[PDB]
Structures are given as C-alpha cells and as structure tokens.
Coordinates of C-alpha atoms and ligand atoms in Angstrom, one line a residue:
Chain A
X177 CA 9.2 25.5 -16.8
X178 CA 7.6 22.1 -17.5
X179 CA 4.6 21.9 -19.9
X180 CA 2.6 19.4 -22.1
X181 CA 2.4 19.8 -25.8
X182 CA -0.7 17.7 -26.6
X183 CA -0.9 16.6 -30.3
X184 CA -4.2 15.4 -31.7
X185 CA -5.2 14.4 -35.3
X186 CA -6.1 11.6 -37.7
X187 CA -3.9 8.7 -38.4
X188 CA -1.1 9.8 -40.8
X189 CA -1.7 13.6 -40.2
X190 CA 1.8 14.0 -39.0
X191 CA 1.9 13.6 -35.2
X192 CA 4.9 11.3 -35.0
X193 CA 6.8 13.2 -37.6
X194 CA 6.2 16.6 -35.9
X195 CA 6.9 15.2 -32.3
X196 CA 10.2 13.7 -33.4
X197 CA 11.3 16.9 -35.2
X198 CA 10.1 19.0 -32.2
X199 CA 11.9 16.8 -29.8
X200 CA 15.2 17.0 -31.8
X201 CA 15.0 20.8 -32.0
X202 CA 14.4 21.1 -28.2
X203 CA 17.3 18.7 -27.2
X204 CA 19.7 20.6 -29.5
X205 CA 18.7 23.8 -27.9
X206 CA 19.2 22.3 -24.4
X207 CA 15.6 22.1 -23.3
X208 CA 14.7 18.8 -21.5
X209 CA 11.8 17.0 -23.2
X210 CA 10.4 13.5 -23.7
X211 CA 7.8 12.2 -26.1
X212 CA 4.9 9.9 -25.2
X213 CA 3.7 7.9 -28.2
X214 CA 2.1 4.5 -29.3
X215 CA 5.5 2.8 -29.1
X216 CA 6.4 3.6 -25.4
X217 CA 2.8 3.8 -24.1
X218 CA 0.5 1.2 -25.8
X219 CA 3.0 -1.6 -25.2
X220 CA 3.9 -0.6 -21.7
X221 CA 1.5 1.2 -19.3
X222 CA -1.3 0.9 -21.8
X223 CA -0.6 -2.7 -23.0
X224 CA -3.9 -3.7 -21.4
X225 CA -6.0 -1.3 -23.4
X226 CA -7.6 -1.7 -26.9
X227 CA -9.5 0.7 -29.2
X228 CA -13.1 0.6 -27.9
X229 CA -14.4 4.1 -27.0
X230 CA -13.9 3.2 -23.3
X231 CA -10.4 2.0 -23.8
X232 CA -9.4 5.1 -25.8
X233 CA -11.0 7.2 -23.0
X234 CA -8.7 5.4 -20.5
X235 CA -5.8 5.5 -22.8
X236 CA -5.9 9.3 -23.0
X237 CA -6.6 9.6 -19.2
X238 CA -3.5 7.7 -18.2
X239 CA -1.5 9.6 -20.8
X240 CA -2.8 12.9 -19.4
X241 CA -1.8 11.9 -15.9
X242 CA 1.7 10.7 -17.1
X243 CA 2.3 13.9 -19.1
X244 CA 1.3 16.0 -16.0
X245 CA 4.1 14.2 -14.1
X246 CA 6.7 14.9 -16.7
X247 CA 5.6 18.5 -16.9
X248 CA 5.7 18.7 -13.1
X249 CA 9.3 17.3 -13.3
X250 CA 10.4 20.2 -15.5
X251 CA 10.2 18.6 -19.0
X252 CA 8.4 19.6 -22.2
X253 CA 6.2 16.5 -22.6
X254 CA 5.1 15.9 -26.2
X255 CA 2.2 13.5 -26.5
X256 CA 1.5 11.9 -29.9
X257 CA -1.9 10.3 -29.9
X258 CA -5.0 10.5 -32.1
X259 CA -7.0 11.5 -29.0
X260 CA -10.2 11.6 -31.1
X261 CA -12.7 12.7 -28.4
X262 CA -13.2 16.3 -27.2
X263 CA -14.3 15.4 -23.7
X264 CA -11.1 13.4 -23.0
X265 CA -8.8 16.1 -24.4
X266 CA -10.7 18.7 -22.3
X267 CA -10.2 16.4 -19.3
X268 CA -6.5 16.1 -20.0
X269 CA -6.3 19.9 -20.1
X270 CA -8.2 20.1 -16.8
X271 CA -5.6 17.8 -15.1
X272 CA -2.8 20.2 -16.0
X273 CA -4.9 23.2 -15.1
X274 CA -5.7 21.8 -11.6
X275 CA -1.9 21.2 -11.1
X276 CA -1.1 24.7 -12.5
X277 CA 0.8 23.3 -15.5
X278 CA 0.8 24.9 -19.0
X279 CA -1.1 22.7 -21.5
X280 CA -1.0 23.4 -25.3
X281 CA -3.5 21.6 -27.5
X282 CA -2.0 21.4 -31.0
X283 CA -4.4 20.2 -33.7
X284 CA -2.2 18.4 -36.3
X285 CA -4.6 18.9 -39.2
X286 CA -4.4 17.2 -42.6
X287 CA -7.7 16.4 -44.4
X288 CA -8.9 12.8 -44.3
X289 CA -8.1 12.5 -48.0
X290 CA -4.5 13.5 -47.6
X291 CA -4.1 11.1 -44.7
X292 CA -5.4 8.2 -46.8
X293 CA -3.3 9.1 -49.8
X294 CA -0.3 9.1 -47.4
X295 CA -1.6 5.7 -46.0
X296 CA 1.7 5.4 -44.1
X297 CA 1.0 1.8 -42.8
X298 CA -1.6 0.5 -45.3
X299 CA -4.3 1.0 -42.6
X300 CA -6.9 3.1 -44.4
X301 CA -7.1 0.6 -47.3
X302 CA -7.8 -2.2 -44.7
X303 CA -10.3 0.0 -42.9
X304 CA -12.1 0.7 -46.1
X305 CA -12.2 -3.0 -47.0
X306 CA -13.6 -3.8 -43.5
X307 CA -10.5 -5.8 -42.8
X308 CA -10.0 -3.4 -39.8
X309 CA -13.1 -2.2 -38.0
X310 CA -13.6 1.0 -36.0
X311 CA -10.7 2.8 -37.6
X312 CA -10.6 6.5 -36.8
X313 CA -12.0 8.7 -39.6
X314 CA -13.5 5.7 -41.5
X315 CA -15.5 3.7 -39.0
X316 CA -15.3 5.8 -35.8
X317 CA -15.3 9.6 -35.3
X318 CA -12.6 12.1 -35.0
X319 CA -13.9 15.3 -33.2
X320 CA -11.8 18.2 -34.2
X321 CA -10.5 20.7 -31.6
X322 CA -12.8 23.8 -31.3
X323 CA -10.2 26.1 -29.8
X324 CA -6.7 24.6 -29.9
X325 CA -3.7 26.7 -29.0
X326 CA -2.3 26.0 -32.5
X327 CA -3.4 24.4 -35.7
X328 CA -0.6 22.7 -37.8
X329 CA -1.6 22.6 -41.4
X330 CA 0.6 19.6 -42.3
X331 CA -0.7 19.5 -46.0
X332 CA 0.4 23.1 -46.6
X333 CA 3.4 23.6 -44.3
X334 CA 6.5 21.3 -44.3
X335 CA 7.8 19.6 -41.1
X336 CA 10.3 22.5 -40.3
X337 CA 7.6 25.1 -40.7
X338 CA 5.4 23.1 -38.3
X339 CA 8.2 22.7 -35.7
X340 CA 8.9 26.5 -35.8
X341 CA 5.3 27.4 -35.2
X342 CA 5.2 25.2 -32.0
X343 CA 8.5 26.7 -30.9
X344 CA 6.9 30.2 -31.5
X345 CA 4.0 29.3 -29.2
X346 CA 6.5 28.0 -26.6
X347 CA 8.4 31.3 -26.8
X348 CA 5.3 33.5 -26.6
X349 CA 4.1 31.5 -23.5
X350 CA 7.5 31.8 -21.8
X351 CA 8.5 28.1 -21.8
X352 CA 11.6 28.5 -24.0
Chain B
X233 CA 21.8 7.1 -18.0
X234 CA 18.4 7.1 -16.1
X235 CA 17.4 4.5 -13.5
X236 CA 14.7 3.5 -11.1
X237 CA 15.4 3.6 -7.3
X238 CA 12.6 1.3 -6.0
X239 CA 12.1 1.9 -2.3
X240 CA 10.3 -0.7 -0.3
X241 CA 9.7 -1.2 3.4
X242 CA 7.3 -0.8 6.3
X243 CA 5.2 2.2 7.1
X244 CA 7.4 4.6 9.1
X245 CA 10.6 2.8 8.0
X246 CA 11.8 6.0 6.2
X247 CA 10.9 5.9 2.5
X248 CA 9.4 9.5 2.4
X249 CA 12.3 10.8 4.3
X250 CA 15.0 9.1 2.3
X251 CA 13.4 9.9 -1.1
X252 CA 13.0 13.7 -0.2
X253 CA 16.7 13.8 1.0
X254 CA 18.0 11.9 -2.0
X255 CA 16.0 14.0 -4.5
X256 CA 17.5 17.2 -2.8
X257 CA 21.0 15.9 -3.1
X258 CA 20.6 14.9 -6.7
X259 CA 19.1 18.1 -7.8
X260 CA 21.7 20.3 -6.2
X261 CA 24.3 18.2 -8.0
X262 CA 22.5 18.9 -11.2
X263 CA 21.2 15.4 -11.7
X264 CA 17.6 15.2 -12.9
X265 CA 15.2 13.1 -10.8
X266 CA 11.6 12.8 -9.9
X267 CA 9.8 10.9 -7.1
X268 CA 6.6 8.9 -7.5
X269 CA 4.7 8.5 -4.2
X270 CA 1.1 8.3 -3.0
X271 CA 0.7 12.0 -3.3
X272 CA 1.3 12.2 -7.1
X273 CA 0.0 8.7 -8.1
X274 CA -2.9 7.6 -5.8
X275 CA -5.4 10.4 -6.9
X276 CA -4.2 10.7 -10.4
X277 CA -3.0 7.8 -12.6
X278 CA -4.2 5.2 -10.1
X279 CA -7.4 6.9 -9.0
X280 CA -9.6 4.3 -10.7
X281 CA -8.0 1.5 -8.6
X282 CA -9.3 0.2 -5.3
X283 CA -8.2 -2.1 -2.5
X284 CA -8.8 -5.5 -4.1
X285 CA -5.8 -7.8 -4.8
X286 CA -6.1 -7.4 -8.5
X287 CA -6.1 -3.6 -8.3
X288 CA -3.1 -3.7 -6.0
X289 CA -1.2 -5.7 -8.6
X290 CA -2.3 -3.2 -11.3
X291 CA -1.3 -0.3 -9.0
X292 CA 2.3 -1.6 -8.8
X293 CA 2.4 -2.5 -12.6
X294 CA 1.4 1.1 -13.6
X295 CA 3.9 2.7 -11.2
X296 CA 6.6 0.5 -12.5
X297 CA 5.7 1.4 -16.1
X298 CA 5.7 5.1 -15.3
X299 CA 9.1 4.8 -13.5
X300 CA 10.5 3.0 -16.6
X301 CA 9.5 6.0 -18.8
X302 CA 11.3 8.4 -16.4
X303 CA 14.4 6.1 -16.5
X304 CA 14.2 6.0 -20.3
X305 CA 13.8 9.8 -20.3
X306 CA 17.1 9.9 -18.4
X307 CA 15.9 10.8 -14.9
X308 CA 16.7 9.0 -11.7
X309 CA 13.2 8.0 -10.8
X310 CA 12.6 7.3 -7.0
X311 CA 9.5 5.4 -6.1
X312 CA 8.3 5.4 -2.5
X313 CA 5.6 2.9 -1.7
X314 CA 5.5 0.2 0.9
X315 CA 5.3 -2.2 -2.0
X316 CA 4.6 -5.3 0.3
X317 CA 4.6 -8.3 -2.1
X318 CA 7.6 -10.1 -3.6
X319 CA 5.7 -11.0 -6.8
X320 CA 4.9 -7.3 -7.4
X321 CA 8.5 -6.0 -6.9
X322 CA 9.8 -8.8 -9.3
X323 CA 7.2 -7.6 -11.8
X324 CA 8.4 -4.0 -11.5
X325 CA 12.0 -5.3 -11.8
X326 CA 11.2 -7.3 -15.0
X327 CA 9.6 -4.4 -16.6
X328 CA 12.9 -2.5 -16.3
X329 CA 15.4 -5.3 -16.9
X330 CA 13.6 -6.4 -20.1
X331 CA 14.4 -3.0 -21.5
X332 CA 17.9 -2.9 -20.0
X333 CA 17.0 0.0 -17.7
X334 CA 18.9 0.0 -14.4
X335 CA 16.6 -1.0 -11.5
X336 CA 17.6 -0.8 -7.9
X337 CA 15.5 -2.6 -5.3
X338 CA 16.3 -0.7 -2.1
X339 CA 15.1 -2.3 1.2
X340 CA 14.3 0.5 3.7
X341 CA 14.8 -1.7 6.7
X342 CA 13.8 -0.7 10.3
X343 CA 12.2 -3.2 12.7
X344 CA 8.5 -3.1 13.2
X345 CA 9.1 -2.0 16.8
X346 CA 10.9 1.1 15.6
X347 CA 8.4 1.9 12.9
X348 CA 5.6 2.1 15.5
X349 CA 7.8 4.2 17.9
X350 CA 7.9 6.5 15.0
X351 CA 4.2 6.9 14.2
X352 CA 4.4 9.6 11.4
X353 CA 1.5 -8.0 5.3
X354 CA 5.1 -7.2 4.3
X355 CA 7.4 -9.7 2.5
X356 CA 11.0 -8.8 2.9
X357 CA 13.1 -8.2 -0.2
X358 CA 14.8 -11.4 -1.2
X359 CA 18.0 -10.1 -2.7
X360 CA 17.7 -6.3 -2.9
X361 CA 20.5 -4.2 -4.5
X362 CA 20.8 -2.2 -1.3
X363 CA 19.6 -2.4 2.3
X364 CA 19.3 0.9 4.2
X365 CA 19.3 0.2 8.0
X366 CA 17.4 3.3 9.0
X367 CA 17.5 2.5 12.7
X368 CA 21.3 2.5 12.8
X369 CA 22.1 5.0 10.0
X370 CA 21.0 8.6 9.8
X371 CA 19.3 10.1 6.7
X372 CA 22.4 11.6 5.2
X373 CA 24.3 8.4 5.6
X374 CA 21.5 6.5 3.9
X375 CA 21.5 9.1 1.0
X376 CA 25.3 8.5 0.5
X377 CA 24.7 4.8 0.4
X378 CA 22.2 5.2 -2.5
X379 CA 24.5 7.7 -4.2
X380 CA 27.4 5.3 -4.0
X381 CA 25.3 2.6 -5.6
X382 CA 24.3 5.0 -8.4
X383 CA 28.0 6.0 -8.9
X384 CA 29.0 2.3 -9.5
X385 CA 26.7 1.8 -12.5
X386 CA 27.5 5.1 -14.2
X387 CA 24.2 6.8 -13.3
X388 CA 25.5 9.7 -11.1
Ligands
LIG64 N1 -9.0 1.1 -34.5 C1 -8.0 2.0 -34.6 N2 -8.2 3.3 -34.8 C2 -7.2 4.2 -34.9 N3 -6.0 3.8 -34.9 C3 -5.6 2.5 -34.7 C4 -6.6 1.5 -34.6 N4 -6.0 0.3 -34.4 C5 -4.7 0.4 -34.4 N5 -4.5 1.7 -34.7 C6 -3.4 2.5 -34.7 O1 -2.9 2.9 -33.4 C7 -2.5 4.3 -33.6 C8 -3.4 5.2 -32.8 O2 -3.3 4.9 -31.4 P1 -3.6 6.1 -30.4 O3 -3.0 7.3 -31.0 O4 -3.3 5.6 -29.0 O5 -5.2 6.2 -30.6 S1 -6.3 6.8 -29.5 O6 -7.5 7.1 -30.2 O7 -6.4 5.9 -28.4 O8 -5.7 8.1 -29.1 C9 -2.5 4.5 -35.1 O9 -1.4 5.2 -35.6 C10 -2.7 3.1 -35.6 O10 -2.1 2.7 -36.7
LIG65 N1 4.3 18.9 -42.4 C1 4.3 17.6 -42.1 N2 4.2 17.2 -40.8 C2 4.2 15.9 -40.5 N3 4.3 15.0 -41.5 C3 4.3 15.3 -42.8 C4 4.3 16.7 -43.1 N4 4.3 16.7 -44.5 C5 4.3 15.5 -45.0 N5 4.3 14.6 -44.0 C6 4.3 13.1 -44.2 C7 5.5 12.4 -43.5 C8 4.8 11.1 -43.0 O1 5.0 10.1 -44.0 C9 3.3 11.4 -42.9 C10 2.9 11.6 -41.5 O2 3.0 10.3 -40.8 P1 3.0 10.3 -39.2 O3 3.8 11.4 -38.6 O4 3.6 8.9 -38.9 O5 1.5 10.4 -38.8 P2 0.7 10.1 -37.4 O6 1.8 10.0 -36.4 O7 -0.2 11.3 -37.2 O8 -0.1 8.9 -37.6 O9 3.1 12.6 -43.7
LIG66 N1 17.9 7.1 8.6 C1 16.6 7.5 8.5 N2 15.9 7.5 7.3 C2 14.6 7.8 7.1 N3 13.9 8.2 8.2 C3 14.5 8.2 9.5 C4 15.9 7.9 9.6 N4 16.2 8.0 10.9 C5 15.1 8.5 11.6 N5 14.1 8.6 10.7 C6 12.8 9.1 11.1 C7 12.4 10.3 10.3 C8 10.9 10.2 10.1 O1 10.3 10.9 11.2 C9 10.6 8.7 10.2 C10 10.4 8.1 8.8 O2 9.1 8.2 8.3 P1 8.7 8.3 6.8 O3 9.9 8.8 6.0 O4 7.4 9.1 6.6 O5 8.3 6.7 6.6 P2 7.7 6.0 5.4 O6 7.7 6.9 4.2 O7 8.5 4.8 5.1 O8 6.3 5.7 5.9 O9 11.8 8.1 10.8

C-alpha cells in the first residue's frame, strides 16, 4: 500500500514541520515512510538545479519520479516542496496515476502575511529588500491548488491537528 | 541499515536474473529492498537524457543519487545496469561513501563468449566488493554470495 503525500505551499507555511510530525506518527505506528525534502534532494539528485521557472519545473519532475518509486516500493512517500506551479503538480499526479499509485495533493495553506511574520530563515525580509530575487510569493508566483485532496490551515490548526487530518485521509483511502 | 548493491557487467551476464532472485530472497525473509533498472528509470526519471557522453554520465549520477535515498530510507537497493565506465561507478561509489552509506560494487562476470551464447565498451571493475562468476555458479549460489556479503556488514 504505497502512496505519495505531496505537500505544496509558500515558504514557512509549515511543510517541513508537518512532514516531520507526519513521518514520526507513521513510524511509531509501524507504517514504512520516507520524506523527500530540500535537504536530501536539492543537495543530491537536484544539486544541479536552481530556482528559474525551468529548474523548478525539473526539480518537481524528478521529485515526482522519485516519489513514484518509493510509492511503488511500498512506502508512504512525503514530499516537502513549495511546488508553486499547477502544471507541474498535475504532471506529478499523472505520473502516479499512470503507474496506478495513490497520490494525495495536500495544500499546506498559511496566508503570505503569516509566512512572513514567521520568517523562519530571514528570507522574506531579504526578498522584500531585493537582496534575494525571484522569491516565491514576493517576486514569483505561487499558484494555489484548485482541488487538493486536503487543505491544511496551518494558521488555525496546530501541528498535531494537521497530522491527524492527513492520517484521516490515509485511513479513508485505505492506506493505513 | 540500508545499502546499495551496485550490479555491473556485460549484456546477458546475469544482472536482471540475479537482481530478481535476490529481491525475492530478501522480501521473503522480511528485508525491504527495491531494484532500479532500465524498466523503472529509463522512461521516468532519466527520460530527458539521451545517448551523448554527458547524458550517460548524468544518467549514472541520478541513479546513484536515487539509490542513496533508498539506502538512507533503510532499503537494500539493487541497481541493475551495464554501468560500463570506471569513472561512473567510482562516482556512484563516492556519492554513497561520502554519506557513510554501505555501497557494494558487484561484478556480474561471465565471458563475452557466454553472454552472446545467451542472447536474451565495458571496463572491468577494478576492485569490486564481490565478483559473481555467473558461468560457473548458478543463480541461487550467486544470491547466497550477495546475502553473505550483506550479513558481514550488518545489513541482513
Ligand atoms: N528563489 C527562491 N524561491 C523560493 N524558495 C527559495 C528560493 N531560493 C532558496 N529558496 C529556498 O528553497 C526552499 C524551497 O525549495 P523548493 O521547495 O525545492 O522550491 S520549488 O519551487 O522548486 O518547489 C525554501 O524553503 C527556501 O528557503
Ligand atoms: N500547524 C502548523 N503546521 C506547521 N507549522 C506550524 C504550524 N503552526 C505553526 N507553525 C510554525 C512552525 C515553524 O516555525 C513554521 C513553519 O516552518 P516550516 O515547516 O519550516 O515551513 P516550510 O517547510 O513550509 O518552509 O511555522
Ligand atoms: N548464475 C547466473 N546468474 C544470472 N543468470 C544466469 C546464471 N546462470 C545462467 N544464467 C542465464 C539466465 C539468463 O537467461 C541469462 C542472464 O540474462 P539477464 O539476467 O537478462 O542478463 P543482463 O541483465 O545482465 O543483461 O543467463
């Protein structure tokens, strides 16, 4: 019963935080899983990709292919990437659909204002000052999911509420 | 914990056969494992890569980076490609060893003569962790050789 839990959302909306708490819950309940994120991807397989529209397109494509393999192998694969473009997220869904694997698009949704008040790594302030260019939500677009399987309201639910909602979806869809 | 079993050898030497047999043995002993081969890599992750030297180097680099994720995830990852160039296998190796993830270069070794008599350029591994003489060992014997290797380094 492998599947891919595809997170998407602005920088600082809560993707890393949710993925890690979701991965902890699953391991403790004896469900194999693995998380793909900036740390293990953008410095390994995707070390040769930047942040131009084309390189974010290829970033997501390779991640989709990789996730599909983990899902195929029997793991719950959590991906934790901004994935700002609808086309690429829809392509990632297609990849899993073609291979008959369950794909759950989870919109991790905190408003831009909350993300920048959180400013977890000081990035929004730099982006605003033009010291970083093409930052998502300031200088390049984030296209919100039109029909995700789940929307996580990370400004109104705490981390554990969010994890429980994802687990709920996984139960209803017969993964766990 | 996890590791990469990196098969290398001529066409018809026995990589597909060994990997299928090894994966079967591991799974029925409750050990997680997944195989990367042309069937799940070539038209997916590496579909935007052609036949040029630069693309073949990038082909191997990506496979090695995906295998490392499976090892890190805790699976025995078996890769099954001809993998002809020493520079490329060393690259794959360094990707793993730099993260302290166990990496086994396994030479699937049958003479060219036999490989053609099978009918289902290459640079021979310099110091591979294991040689499988597939002309003189049967499939099950080759599997036990790999499993014995895995048992030594606390993988299996
Ligand atoms: N130009 C940028 N836009 C958005 N995030 C960036 C940028 N440069 C570096 N980062 C950062 O890289 C992370 C986002 O990387 P990804 O999630 O891999 O983005 S994606 O758009 O290609 O999906 C952010 O947490 C972050 O701090
Ligand atoms: N319900 C929730 N889910 C996730 N994070 C939350 C949250 N409520 C508050 N936070 C906080 C914790 C983190 O400091 C911050 C999110 O940062 P993050 O998970 O690193 O973001 P991202 O990975 O999307 O860039 O917001
Ligand atoms: N010990 C052994 N290991 C692997 N294959 C063996 C073998 N002894 C005989 N064979 C036969 C079985 C297959 O028909 C053939 C191997 O072909 P294959 O596994 O498709 O090669 P490759 O994947 O290396 O191209 O050789």
